[PDB]
Each structure stands twice: as structure tokens, then as C-alpha cells.
Homo-oligomer: A and B are copies of this chain.
Amino acid sequence: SKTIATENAPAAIGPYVQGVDLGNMIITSGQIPVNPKTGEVPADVAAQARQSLDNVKAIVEAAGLKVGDIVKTTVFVKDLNDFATVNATYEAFFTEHNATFPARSCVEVARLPKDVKIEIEAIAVRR
């Protein structure tokens, strides 16, 4: 197994790595909507969902996989009242990559790192 490290997702400053490549299975850390170019977080929940998904994509692609290889996500949100918006963005993201939708779990948590509105972790497979 090996660490996945890419400039295309926010740098792993704390005691974690961006993701792990286990051979057939890749697992990402929970991605928050931090822009890897600027370090900023967009205000808009739809934009946050998209930034988190782009961060997941960067890690999966750094391991040689595609968005279409993602088979399971967990989506942690700060407010389920914004879920229609998140769902629309999430759906669009997968559609843009001609990807079958992953299996998913979705819950509203009390708070997320940096007070973001969403955090998404993903599992992808080579086969």
C-alpha cells in the first residue's frame, strides 16, 4: 500500500495523508471544500459540494483511476435543508464523468472542520 499525494487537492498538513492506494482499492480522506490553488472555501453550498468532489477526483486520478471508478462515498453535511442543491451538484458531477453513481451514505453532522458545509470521503476500485 502507498500514500496518494497530489498538488491537485489541498495539502495534507495535519496527521493524515490525502488518500491511500491499496492495490485494487483506493480510499480518500474526507475532502472539505478548500480550493487547492488558493486555500479559500467558496460560500455557496453548491460550490462547496463541487469543490469537495473535485478534491476527491484529484486524489482518485492521482492513483490512476477515474471518477467512474468511485464505488462508495459518505457525504457528511452541516444542513440537510441544503440537500436538494447538493444532490443536484453531485448528480451533475457524476454525469459529467459518464460515471455510474456510487453507493452512498448521507447524514447531517453537528459541525465539520473549518465550519464547512460538506465533507466527502470516497472509495474507488481498479477492477
* A residues adjacent to B (C-beta < 8 A): 1, 3, 12, 14-20, 22-23, 25, 27-30, 71-72, 74, 76, 80, 83, 87, 90-91, 94, 100-113, 119, 121, 123, 125, 127
Partner of A30, one of B87, B105, B109: B105
The complex places the Cα of A30 from the Cα of B94 at a distance, in Å, of 19
- Residues of B contacting A127 with CB < 8 Å? 1, 22-23
- Residues of B contacting A1 with CB < 8 Å? 71, 125, 127
Quick check: A107 and B22 within 8 Å, CB to CB? no
Quick check: B108 and A110 within 8 Å, CB to CB? yes
The complex places the Cα of A61 from the Cα of B109 at a distance, in Å, of 30
Q: A14-B87, A80-B111, A113-B83 are in contact. Are A27 and B94 (CB under 8 A)?
A: no
Quick check: A106 and B17 within 8 Å, CB to CB? no
- Residues of B contacting A123 with CB < 8 Å? 27
Quick check: A104 and B16 within 8 Å, CB to CB? yes
* 6 contacting pairs across A/B (C-beta < 8 A): A16-B102, A22-B125, A29-B104, A30-B106, A83-B113, A109-B109
The complex places the Cα of A72 from the Cα of B105 at a distance, in Å, of 14
The complex places the Cα of A113 from the Cα of B106 at a distance, in Å, of 7
